[PDB]
Amino acid sequence: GSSGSSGLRKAVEDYFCFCYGKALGTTVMVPVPYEKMLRDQSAVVVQGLPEGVAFQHPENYDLATLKWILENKAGISFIINRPFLGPESQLGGSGPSSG
Numbered sequence: 001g002s003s004g005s006s007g008l009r010k011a012v013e014d015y016f017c018f019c020y021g022k023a024l025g026t027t028v029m030v031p032v033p034y035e036k037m038l039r040d041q042s043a044v045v046v047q048g049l050p051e052g053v054a055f056q057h058p059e060n061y062d063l064a065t066l067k068w069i070l071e072n073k074a075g076i077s078f079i080i081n082r083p084f085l086g087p088e089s090q091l092g093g094s095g096p097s098s099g
Contacts, residue, residue: 004017
């Protein structure tokens, strides 16, 4: 499944999602499409970050920053502007594919 409680880096990730999910208007967690945002920032905007700090993967953020983001997450907000484009649907359901 998709859990996230222990650890910091993850926590930051588990959070960022909750945001996107809260922005999307869902009641679950969404996998922040970094590659997307990274590639083009004309989809989702980031607000509430530290000076001279992007929303880049947290895995990079220094143990300090990571804690910073968390210490200033209430300020972090995903300013949605528009959805993404391209071939992608993904059905809602998981199953063990044998073979």
